[PDB]
């Protein structure tokens, strides 16, 4: 949702967001290699 773009308790930490970015880069590298 933040990539595409009231009161909530759902938040994304920067630690988890960086980990998601790194893992997505891993997956994209795999997709390009296949």
């Amino acid at each position: 949702q933040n990539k595409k773009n009231s009161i909530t308790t759902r938040t994304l930490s920067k630690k988890r967001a960086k980990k998601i970015e790194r893992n997505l880069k891993y997956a994209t590298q795999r997709k390009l290699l296949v």
Partner: protein, 175 residues
């Protein structure tokens, strides 16, 4: 950071907090609930009137053996009080939140208290000496207070073949 709840679209919101504040947790919870959901200027004027004893904070949960007053009839209660220390701490946090919203550039006439939350800080543990050479606890119950003010802004149906035939027949019978 790490509020109890955040606002989506933080660009239209401001927040404030105060931790380990030596003020009664029960009174402060009552004050925060009395303020919850209001517009900011109305809340500030109401707290000023509470300090002047023209209006009252209704006491809904932490209210056993409280006195009764006619000023609780505005909120459909008989038990209300005027906790000055709690009102002053909440006034300070409201002023800070308004200042943060002004620094962000938000319209100050559309701000409302979208979130407010009081929970218990670690206790201040004094002790007293009592009869027969006893030591009894004598403790303050401090508060953590947080708030967020927000700019207020103004189907596939699965049918069986029998149902489909019934609808088609109705369509043929009608225009």
């Amino acid at each position: 950071a790490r509020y109890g709840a955040t606002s989506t679209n933080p660009a239209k919101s401001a927040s404030a907090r105060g931790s380990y504040l030596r003020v009664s947790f029960k009174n402060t919870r009552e004050t925060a609930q009395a303020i919850n959901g209001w517009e900011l200027t109305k809340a500030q004027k109401y707290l000023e009137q509470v300090l002047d004893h023209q209006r009252a904070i209704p006491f809904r949960r932490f209210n056993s053996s409280i006195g009764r007053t006619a000023q609780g009839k505005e909120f459909g209660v008989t038990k209300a009080r005027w906790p000055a220390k709690s009102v002053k701490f909440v006034q300070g946090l409201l002023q800070n939140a308004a200042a943060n919203a002004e620094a962000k550039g938000l319209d100050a006439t559309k701000l409302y208290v979208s979130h407010i939350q009081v929970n218990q800080a670690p206790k201040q543990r004094r002790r007293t000496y009592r009869a027969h050479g006893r030591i009894n606890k004598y403790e303050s119950s401090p508060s953590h207070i947080e708030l967020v003010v927000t700019e207020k802004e103004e189907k596939v149906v699965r049918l069986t073949s029998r149902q489909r035939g019934r609808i088609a027949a109705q369509k043929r019978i009608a225009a």
